[model samples]
Target: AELKMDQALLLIHNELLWTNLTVYWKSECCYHCLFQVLVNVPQSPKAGKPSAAAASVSTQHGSILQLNDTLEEKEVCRLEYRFGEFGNYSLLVKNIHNGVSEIACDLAVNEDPVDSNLPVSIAFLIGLAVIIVISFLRLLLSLDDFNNWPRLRSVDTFRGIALILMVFVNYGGGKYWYFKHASWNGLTVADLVFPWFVFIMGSSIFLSMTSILQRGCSKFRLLGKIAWRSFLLICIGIIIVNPNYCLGPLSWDKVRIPGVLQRLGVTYFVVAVLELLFAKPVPEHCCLSLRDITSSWPQWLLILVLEGLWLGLTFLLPVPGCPTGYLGPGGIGDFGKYPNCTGGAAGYIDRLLLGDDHLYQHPSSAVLYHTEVAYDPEGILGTINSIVMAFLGVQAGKILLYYKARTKDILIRFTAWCCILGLISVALTKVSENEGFIPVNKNLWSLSYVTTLSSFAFFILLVLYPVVDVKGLWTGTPFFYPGMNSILVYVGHEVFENYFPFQWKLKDNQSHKEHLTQNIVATALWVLIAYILYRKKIFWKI
Candidate 1:
């Protein structure tokens, strides 16, 4: 079964004299095509032009068509029309006399255009309205016990928001294009969650490790715990949640080695161990200073070195057939220049060390670029940046701990970090998607990608800390519950993704309404589960 989307049929009638017509069309998502027809009308009467040479084209939203006279080697006319999906239309290309011969394109609608996004837009409006009503109701029932609430509510709430979005997007996010990962060199809703999760994990690592060490936990024992937890995460990723399970019993040849959990496990191990080795207990009632950063110089040095390794390997290490510092997605990307060089050095390293059978077989690049090579976004090289991302999160945790309850100081620092990272991202990306030196790609986990996402994470914390913790204007609601048991929610959602209540047969497989409802329901179910678990004081810690 092929994936279905709204489409419209367009018939182009060429009535120009002694001209070969070529119709070219382009869409927003880099989809383009051309249709050519030889239309040599030999000075015939305007009424009877031998059924004008016609070409039928299938098109979608935001499509622009150009009609070119191939015989004259010049452009004749251009047409930009909003042809609704599943609608049919005809175009007449002819000469219009207004004191001169001018080629004009006229459109005739055979059927009305359909609004494919209507259902999704209506659903979004309803959801927004519901949220507004709930907020109003909550405001009406306000309490004055704001001071008793914990200062870290915002952190958990932010984490919860990212987790809920992660679950929703992974469940398909109504199969919307923006809800999906960017094809190659851009960012999308699907791209933001994972990095945000990693950033928060970094923050959590510092917070939890400091608390544990402060409680007189032995370094050796904590190290053992970290090792075991990392091991379990990796094992669960490879065994319990392997994508190949659907094909039957696990086959090592097809079982992907690098994955979301696997990357998380490795990143956790590195950052946690780094923190444990150089960890210091939080000072009590210390005046604000730059000690938060100065004290963690050792960790910063190591993280910098890890980042250096990623940069050097990504740019300097050359693959045999690909260009040096090649970062473009292969296949149709770059004008089909390097079809087998997807991910460049990153893909090569993964294939060399882990073998072609071990990496992800179906990458998001295949959707548009049609890359045939097996490339894993969570490969070893990208893990270096993953660690770098987590370490930034560690910086956030340090800010919260070092600044203590001085809300002004904490907010100021968060703002400062946001500006700093934001500038780095601007320098690297130049605010363009594909033209940047290092595009904001989630797949490659490019340095720019890390900077951009970390910047966003800090901005989120800046907003959340004030609203949920300081002002106590909001409680983080449904998000906070899921945030508390993210590990359980993430693993559970993946393990039971295909089970009943999560997924069901859709009456209209092509409708976004059904898919959106299914994904939202599944994500909501996890939130409810987490809420119940929270009520029972049950948390899955690994």
Candidate 2:
């Protein structure tokens, strides 16, 4: 696909001061400084005469403009305005002296700012319509077969939903803000998928391991398989899917060490081994009790300890030149006090253990906070929480196993878990974005983040289990196809991201509609591929 640059021009008029004004414009979306210029205003012939200076500054559709006194470092005024494609804008700087020396900025727009939310809403409506059509067709054709469908369809359906969403968001989700990861200290649709995938892996570990053990598979053999699978995941992540692969295949120095697959591999190893060590056969005729949780007390204790360790390290570790327990993304954040702190303890540890060159160079914090430090979201510290999240998945699997025939009991437990986790999140986050005790941060994988996502995971299961498995109103089609062979879909999507059919040249580079169409097409193509692969029984187990 050919890349095209789209920019807007800004004209600055100075009416406040007699001196040349320093003007700067930055991308509001990424906080990237786009243009800085010295506006040389012509001297006014008489007092109170307006001195006009026109500077053709390149800017984005959404950007911030700052006017500063040339003689002093103090800023006079700042304005946030959105522009249209190749549109011209006028920024007026004026001084309002009503007993106070105050400055005000006025923006004149040639075209109204595009409605950013309209494209996202349209895409959502289209997806809803497609699902409805599919459901109606299935009702007409396969109504009688619904009851005979597999009872475990919910699990695969849930997995499929997360996987497809992962692919969609990664493909840019039509360049919408909600589809992208939060810059820092918040959550987005993109942030939910990885942890949910990890959670599903945890559930799979228990379900599959128990089946293997029941088949008389030796522990040593299972251990070997686990090790090999984890090794393959890490290897593929580092070698084939490294973000720095674009820098050249042999760019070892700049290759990112910590990444999504690497974290998944490490998380799977920890959670799987923990389950294997505590493996127990499900009783054929067990009484209804809390045995599902009570039996796994030791595992819970270990997970809690790991969480405690994460909290301790995150809050107590003294990062040189950074505040203790500093969770704020450095840069212009925190009033621009600690520009180098970035992720604080988390950033410090990754940079110390893995060199700055080996970490993810462009973090999400660079978007809105303008951070410069190399901080990996999937770094070593965050892996601890990833393991914790997967362990929660392991718990869910245990619930399903222990209460196999009892639908009500299984649902009750799932509900209880949702409530418990939700309460914890409420206490930690106070349901606010930045004003929480521990903000729900995907980058840090904060404790509150795990709790909130876990709650949502259980809620998803609670909805899917009854609708797809018990009531049989839905067959989990389409999504179920991708769910069955997730490894192939995930790895395949990443490896073939830029290939033909998945990506193409855009007709209107700046239009959200064009980007949305391309992204949705790419994601739908992958789903189609998964569906075809499923029909052929071509499953990639690893």
Candidate 3:
């Protein structure tokens, strides 16, 4: 039999080191100390049950433990707090049939805890050491050597940074919630990565295409390259990264049709063709100024129209069961009413056309947000916004080309783009989930998501541009190495994600320290590999 509704008040009289705790109520209730027995009861018969008024106190301060919600026995209700400063505390037992509750107060928490920062500080120190070592190696090269490199170190550096961060986040960022994709309808550190890569892809596309055009390459050759590359990316995603391959024979009936690299390849194909078709030769009087904006307005208008079409399809398209224009995450998201609505219209379109068998079996939001439908984050409808995201990158490229020698003008234009996109994002989402017309969701690739990330992409460039390109204050190393060899690293990590060194046996899966250590070390190893490739002048270009 459980105790009736009861509570315990823990009063601490002094500050003492707390290392552990075990608090429980016994069921038999007999072994009271003689003093307790004497004070609470008269001499009773041997067979009578002990009085219910009983209390037990153990001194030697309190104890520290991993936060948990279980008792000494696995089946009982217990409360534990593994944080904050030490002090007097209170505990309540709610065994009443109704809604009585248990409250643990003050709880001697380490309010200014240092344990959380230990792993972070250790990672920083190790990274600093690696930088110092690399700086010495950089000194071994001639000053003119860097001049022989690409003019835009900033672009590759941007790619490098994004890749490194991607590696970290993909490795679970020590299982932190903010490091993961949001449950639904918002952004995270993980969300920022893929878009930055896409933005840089757009930047790279424009730059590389300009270089190719200047060399007098035929459109036929360009088209062939785009076709082959897109095919390879799609195939690689399906064959190499698909989870189904690990299970048994390839199951075409249930294999997902969309994926990260597939989306990138497709977006690249579209954006590249648009540029190739609309790009005009520079006029002799092209002064590398703002006037060029009007010259490219035709291409810009096409992208604008595409964006409008995406919005129309997303909001206006109707499904039989879901609300028209619904953007809620569904499955307990809209107050648990629209359980199958998962990605809403975006999800409905995929299910209707792609069929659940040929879609992702589990979405990233499934566990966290409790989504029911098999919605792909890289679905067909969301690809339109993805193309828009890449187009913004192309626009960034235009800014660079038009203001070739005007550094001040280039920076100003970049800043202006950032401000514009930021305003658009805030207007759509009001800077929060489900607050405004559209939430900035990476999974849905919402319009606001694209604009907000583009804003961040530009902001990153604004900071890196001068440090890397203008002042040459930084070498753009380590990151530059990874950037120069991104395709190889990206594929390699995925292929060997579960292997040794990249992963290891852990006695405690719940330990953030162990998980974070593995993640940071694996990511650093990739950077080191990139650095060695840089030394060997080896680059894997797709």
The reply for model 2, stretches above 4 Å from the true place, is 1-10, 17-68, 71-89, 94-107, 117-151, 243-249, 284-288
Which pairs clash (backbone N, Cα, C closer than 3 Å) in model 3?
19-64, 20-63, 20-64, 84-109, 84-110, 84-111, 85-109, 85-110, 85-111, 87-108
The C-alpha stretches of model 1 lying farther than 4 A from their native spots are 1-3, 14-25, 29-84, 95-151, 244-250, 285-288
lDDT scores in order: 0.80, 0.80, 0.70
Window of ten residues with lowest summed lDDT in model 3: 29-38
Per-residue alpha-carbon lDDT of model 2 for 187-231, expressed as tens digits? 888998878888888997888898889989899899899999999
Residues 398-487 of candidate 1 have per-residue lDDT tens digits of 998878868999999999999999999999999987877888888899999999999999999998887888888998877888777888
TM-score of 1: 0.85
TM-scores of all predicted structures: 0.85, 0.85, 0.77
Task: Assess the local accuracy of residue 4 in candidate 1 as a C-alpha lDDT between 0 and 100.
Answer: 45
**How do the candidates rank by lDDT, highest first?**
2, 1, 3
Q: Report backbone clashes per prediction.
A: 1, 1, 10
For candidate 1, the per-residue lDDT at 362 reads 86
- Please state the error at residue 77 of candidate 2 in Å: 5.3
